[PDB]
């Protein structure tokens, strides 16, 4: 970044030799792990698809991805929740559906 050295502007402030902070593991809180990765793998096929999601995947194959997200937002909460979710379903389609 490097502050332009002055009071206002895009990089407002004094520029005193950056020191590259330590790599705190906590920033990597949302860790994946070959463990959980493979754990959630099983559980998904074990428990299967949750009934509101059946309506969801079919929702796509029928009216489309756009309309399904509208229903995924009126299902979960945040919009991103829905996009991440819908995108996750095409991963489920791509598998069983094709190869």
């Amino acid at each position: 970044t490097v502050k332009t050295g002055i009071a206002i502007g895009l990089n407002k402030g004094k520029k005193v030799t950056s020191m590259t902070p330590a790599p705190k593991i906590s920033y990597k809180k949302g860790a994946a792990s070959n463990r959980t990765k493979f754990v959630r793998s099983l559980v998904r096929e074990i428990a299967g698809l949750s009934p509101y999601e059946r309506r969801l995947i079919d929702l796509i194959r029928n009216s489309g991805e756009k309309r399904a997200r509208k229903v995924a937002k009126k299902r979960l909460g945040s919009f991103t929740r829905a996009k991440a979710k819908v995108e996750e379903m095409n991963n489920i389609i791509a598998a069983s559906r094709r190869h």
Binding site: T4, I6, A7, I8, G9, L10, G13, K14, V16, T17, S18, M19, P21, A22
Partner: protein
């Protein structure tokens, strides 16, 4: 109710505030009791300076970012930079802060010199029973004071170049104000077909 040229007063005494009152008559007693409990902790804390070695740091926001202040700990990177470990620095009286980071080399060397000055001041007693008498100081903060880093020399030569400074600001303002629209323009321009 409302008469004369008097300035509108907002006194919030409509509640039964007469039961939440706290006249500090104990102001004196508190002081003494606070100095004795402090002077007794010292005659139990043995030769240690009550308070540990508090670090130098630079206070936040547009306002105080020009005043270096006695922080809290010492980051785990600066203790390894001093040579000793944190699981040890606390047992020696060198206040350590795990969550504080380090993005300023000046503040950094300011603390490692603050730690070197101190590792050459401590009179650690090994767990034997010899106990080499070295009296007891009463202030770790008094012994290692803080002096805002020397910024510039009182005098220097006048280096003019005709930037006006006032213009460098006014412009720098606009460059931040229209950075966006000008960024969308280079977006709606690089989009030639």
């Amino acid at each position: 109710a409302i008469s004369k040229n008097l300035p509108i007063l907002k006194n919030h005494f409509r509640k039964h505030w007469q039961e939440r009152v706290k006249v500090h008559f104990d102001q004196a007693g508190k002081k003494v009791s606070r100095r004795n409990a402090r002077a007794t902790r010292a005659a139990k804390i043995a030769p240690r300076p009550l308070d540990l070695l508090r670090p130098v740091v630079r206070a936040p926001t547009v306002k105080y970012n020009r005043k270096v202040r006695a922080g809290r700990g010492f980051t785990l990177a600066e203790v390894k930079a001093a040579g000793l470990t944190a699981a040890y620095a606390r047992t020696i009286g060198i206040a350590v802060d795990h969550r504080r980071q380090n993005r300023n080399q000046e503040i950094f060397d300011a603390n490692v010199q603050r730690l070197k000055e101190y590792q050459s001041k401590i009179i650690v007693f090994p767990r034997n029973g010899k106990a080499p008498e070295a009296e007891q100081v009463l202030s770790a903060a008094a012994t290692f004071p803080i002096a805002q880093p020397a910024t510039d020399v009182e005098a220097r030569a006048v280096q003019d170049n005709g930037e006006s400074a006032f213009r460098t600001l006014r412009l720098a303002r606009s460059e931040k104000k229209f950075r966006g629209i000008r960024e969308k323009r280079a977006r709606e321009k690089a989009e030639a077909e």
